[PDB]
Amino acid sequence: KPRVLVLTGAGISAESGIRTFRAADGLWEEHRVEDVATPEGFDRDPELVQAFYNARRRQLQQPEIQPNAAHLALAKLQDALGDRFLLVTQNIDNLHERAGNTNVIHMHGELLKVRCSQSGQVLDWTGDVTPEDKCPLRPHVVWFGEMPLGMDEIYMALSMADIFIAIGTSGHVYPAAGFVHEAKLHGAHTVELNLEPSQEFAEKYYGPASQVVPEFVEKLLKGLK
């Protein structure tokens, strides 16, 4: 019964219809990341940014968007390992939650939540955020230049993990991209499941998430039957 820590990146939701928030391209939905994902871009033109996420939140809840095979396998993995499992995601979508996972740590926030520019308090939110809402309100999404959420619990799980699995994460966004090193530093067996290479991993597989993830999860679960 190994302790397992899984870190997921935008890639896993790609097959579900949620266009990967590129960064090497610098364009997220035809928008500059510095313009829609930095505290500066916001203060500069809040209306536009608000509109940008309103559109992201909207699309997130459309019929054609649902968890894929990779999300589901991760729910099966949690079902099996219970308290020895921890899922950390850099994603702001709720596909892991819809698949069946619980206690998912959203280090970069959640698209279906918001917070007030003054108190910071958080409250659920599924619709659009209009110029007429207050405790002012902004997306509960960690922008570049801001501090990730749950870092204390994440770092604790990393020091405790027997197996650290990084799924479809681009070795480009830190601190998340540095987790593999931490895990490896504490003796964990590191695994990388990605569409493509570019990511200290002892075991690695490449190909569509909905194919690679379920396969690895099955191998692992069977392996410790």
Partner: peptide, 8 residues
């Protein structure tokens, strides 16, 4: 620990 969200 870890620092702010950032891109290499």
């Amino acid at each position: 620990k870890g620092g702010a969200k950032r891109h290499r």
